[PDB]
């Protein structure tokens, strides 16, 4: 619970820091869970979403539809997927943006900074 | 069209109920009304009137005035009755035994009475030992000895205490307080 003087429980300072969040701390505000498959290859449970990731949807009117991310929208706090899109009436097709908390990761993309974070959070990677 | 020679729905000027919320008082009053019904004794009737009195009408009865009652006719070996609390008079020295049947007893009062060889019983215990009031001696408190009662009835030539925090000269002792400054009241 609340025991420290440096933490705030105020709802306005939360929806203020959230509605006016910078892009660097935005990759933070948009973290996503792994699968039990990935929770056994590393042991970690969280990690922000990126362009080169394959994520599955387990919630909403898209119950059971996976795909590879096209371009994540930090501006609105979402992410587009090329395999999960919506068509319009004029015939034009425009992808869909959703929240990464409902999207569990199946496949990940590792680089220099990515493998460093695996050991930093408490994993074993591969 | 009846002409009412006096006044309408005029309340007796008494209390049919106590202006208090004491849980133990609702219990005390209940048993004394039971007696004012089936005994006839004038005792339970005047005592039932004291259950609706204020602290002004229930002044603290001191044990020095109680010691005066033991030195009188009939109260040598009689029990005393008190309406309210009992205060310890650190002004007396000698006292016998006897019994006290008061509502309350201050720590100080209850100490010297029981220490001198006496007892301090509540209203209810002595009520069972004396149903109609057999061997009782009830007393009152100094009502017209209050700070407020002094300032009641103030007018010229009377002398019923004037209200003011500060005492001494320069405080209502000028014009109208000496035969020299116009007059002296």
């Amino acid at each position: 619970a609340k025991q420290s003087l440096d933490v705030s429980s105020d709802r306005r300072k939360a929806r203020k820091a959230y509605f006016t969040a910078p892009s660097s701390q935005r990759r933070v505000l948009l973290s996503a869970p792994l699968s039990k498959e990935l929770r056994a290859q590393y042991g970690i449970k969280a990690l922000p979403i990126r362009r080169d990731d394959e994520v599955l949807v387990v919630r909403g009117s898209k119950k059971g539809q996976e795909g590879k991310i096209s371009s994540v929208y930090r501006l609105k706090f979402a992410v587009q997927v090329d395999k999960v899109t919506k068509e319009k009436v004029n015939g034009a097709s425009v992808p869909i943006n959703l929240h990464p908390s409902k999207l569990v990761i199946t496949k990940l993309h590792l680089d220099k900074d990515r493998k460093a974070l695996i050991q930093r959070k408490g994993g074993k990677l591969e | 069209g009846i002409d009412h020679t006096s006044k309408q729905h005029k309340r007796s000027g008494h209390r049919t109920a106590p202006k208090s919320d004491n849980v133990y008082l609702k219990l005390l009053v209940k048993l004394y009304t039971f007696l004012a019904r089936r005994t006839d004794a004038p005792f339970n009737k005047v005592v039932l009137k004291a259950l609706f009195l204020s602290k002004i009408n229930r002044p603290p009865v001191s044990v020095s005035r109680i010691a005066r009652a033991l030195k009188q006719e009939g109260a040598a070996n009689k029990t005393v009755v008190v309406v309210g609390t009992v205060t310890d008079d650190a002004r007396i020295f000698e006292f016998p035994k006897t019994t006290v049947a008061a509502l309350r007893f201050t720590a100080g009062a209850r100490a010297k009475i029981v220490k001198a060889g006496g007892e301090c019983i509540t209203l209810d215990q002595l009520a069972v030992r004396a149903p109609k009031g057999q061997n009782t001696l009830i007393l009152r408190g100094p009502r017209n000895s209050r700070e407020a009662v002094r300032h009641f009835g103030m007018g010229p030539h009377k002398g019923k205490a004037p209200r003011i925090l500060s005492t001494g000269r320069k405080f209502e002792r000028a014009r109208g307080r000496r035969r020299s400054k116009g007059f002296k009241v």
């Binding site: - | 919320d21 004491n22 849980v23 133990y24």
Partner: protein, 51 residues
């Protein structure tokens, strides 16, 4: 002649250890004094506000 109260352990059960009582339980109970004093202590844990 104390009323006595049975001791309990962490898994429930009553213990053979019967003990006397503080006696503040056989004392006066005034729910009316509480009423008035309760509204007073609530004002103790407050703050202020102006324009």
């Amino acid at each position: 002649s104390r009323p006595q109260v049975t001791v309990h352990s962490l898994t429930g059960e009553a213990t053979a250890n019967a003990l006397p009582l503080p006696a503040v339980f056989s004392a006066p109970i005034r729910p009316d004094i509480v009423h008035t004093v309760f509204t007073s202590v609530n004002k103790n844990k407050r703050q202020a506000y102006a324009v």
